[PDB]
Amino acid sequence: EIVFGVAHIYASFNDTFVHVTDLSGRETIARVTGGMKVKADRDEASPYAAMLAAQDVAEKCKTLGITALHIKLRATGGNKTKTPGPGAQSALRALARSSMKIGRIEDVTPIPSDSTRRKGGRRGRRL
RNA sequence: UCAGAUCAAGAGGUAAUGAUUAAUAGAAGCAGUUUGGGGGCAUUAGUAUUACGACGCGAGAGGUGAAAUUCUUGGACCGU
C-alpha cells in the first residue's frame, strides 16, 4: 500500500508554497500557500504560517487518499538567495506530525552555471 | 753597367704558416620531453534568467523597515 505525492515546498522568503501534486506534477492538488491564511504582508515569511498551511494540505490529500508523498524544497535561488527561508521545514514537521509517511527529501532548487546579471548594480542594496 | 729611388720577384720553396676564451652574458637550435583561465579562428556543452505554447489548480502574487507603485477581462503566482 504505497501511493505517492510530491509536496513541492517552494520555501521562499516572504511566502511559502505548499503545493502538493501528483507524481508527474502535471496535476495539482490543494494549492495552499502560506499567503492565503494570514494577511499582514510580513508574517507570511513566518514558520507558523508554514506550520498551519502545510497540514492544511494534509486533509485535502486525504480527500483523494494518498498516504505517502515526497518533498521538494526550493530556495528560491536562480541568480538569488539559493537557500530556503525561515518557514522552510517547519512545514516538514507540520506534515509528518499530521499522519503522513514521508520518505523523499530533496533540494530541487536549481543552480546556474553562471548568472546573467542580478539586481542591484555593483554596490547593491545601500541601506 | 752602378742604375739614389721605384713596380713586380724565376711563384713551385725554406718559415710549429695564421681562427684566444666559450661568460652561473646573449642569441639561435634540438632525435628534445613537456607545461600554462596566454592570443586567434571554428566547433560545442551547461544549468539558469526571461518570453511565449499546452495542462492542472484556484486567489492571490511581486516586493519592503512598513509600504505602495506593479502583476491577476479571474486561468496569475505555482506546478509541469
Swiss-Prot record:
List the molecular function annotations (GO) for this entry.
structural constituent of ribosome
Protein's UniProt keywords contain Ribosomal protein:
yes
Question: Protein biosynthesis as a keyword?
Answer: no
**Where in this protein does the record put region Disordered?**
107-127
Q: Name one GO biological process term.
A: ribosomal small subunit assembly
Record key words, sorted: Ribonucleoprotein, Ribosomal protein
Please note every region of biased composition (Basic residues): 118-127
Q: Which GO terms describe its cellular component?
A: cytosolic ribosome; cytosolic small ribosomal subunit
Family, similarity comment:
Belongs to the universal ribosomal protein uS11 family.
Q: Any idea what this protein is called?
A: Small ribosomal subunit protein uS11A
Origin organism lineage = Eukaryota, Metazoa, Ecdysozoa, Arthropoda, Hexapoda
Gene of this entry: RpS14a
From which residue to which, out of the full length, is covered?
Answer: 25 to 151 of 151
